[PDB]
UniProtKB/Swiss-Prot annotation:
Database matches in PROSITE patterns: PPM_2
Lineage: Bacteria, Bacillati, Bacillota, Bacilli, Bacillales
Gene3D superfamilies, per database record: PPM-type phosphatase domain
Catalytic activity, EC: 3.1.3.3
Gene for this chain: rsbX
UniProt enzyme class: hydrolase
Job of this protein: Negative regulator of sigma-B activity. Dephosphorylates RsbS. Plays a role both in maintaining low sigma-B activity during growth and in reestablishing prestress sigma-B activity after induction. Could have a negative feedback role by indirectly communicating sigma-B protein levels.
Organism whose genome encodes this protein: Bacillus subtilis (strain 168)
PANTHER family: PHOSPHOSERINE PHOSPHATASE RSBX
GO function terms (MF aspect): L-phosphoserine phosphatase activity; phosphoprotein phosphatase activity
Residues annotated as domain PPM-type phosphatase: 11-198
Protein name as it appears in the record: Phosphoserine phosphatase RsbX
Amino acid sequence: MIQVEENEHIQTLVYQLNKEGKSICGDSFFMKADDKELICAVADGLGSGSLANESSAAIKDLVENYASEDVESIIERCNQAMKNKRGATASILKINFEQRQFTYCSVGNVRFILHSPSGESFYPLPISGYLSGKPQKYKTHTATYEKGSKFIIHTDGLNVPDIRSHLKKGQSVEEISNSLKMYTTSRKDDLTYILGQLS
Ligand SMILES: [Mg+2]
């Protein structure tokens, strides 16, 4: 499944495909852009079956409902919802277009890379553990992006040797998605990513 969106400030693409032979996806995402801001999130539930989905879906729902809150507030609501669930790894990104500012918070192995035309990339290491409902010490990143920046948020189903290179070379989110096609054919795990290109 691919879904694309565009406005004056960003173009996005969401790709999601299940593990080969698996009916219920354990990954979830949420994406919403208006003329002023973007909210998005990607999550990968622990365990299997309906229980992995229950966990990542709870995140999708909370990010949509609480989108106006700061990322660390949203992720903490997500953490509380994991109590008595399998838990999930997750990443939450908010962008304010007028300021060209983004904020980011994550726990676990859902990765985020933002590539600047200047050749700088924001590429945090994964934070160990997962959202389990137990106490977290969140790390929130706040920074300015330059026009022309491109980014990806992806679950562990996408395993690419040099993701930065794909972002640098691609001229649109459709091109970057096509550039990643060889990593999507095996379907060893659920695979979810969100691409963005920022004006
Ligand atoms: Mg996974």
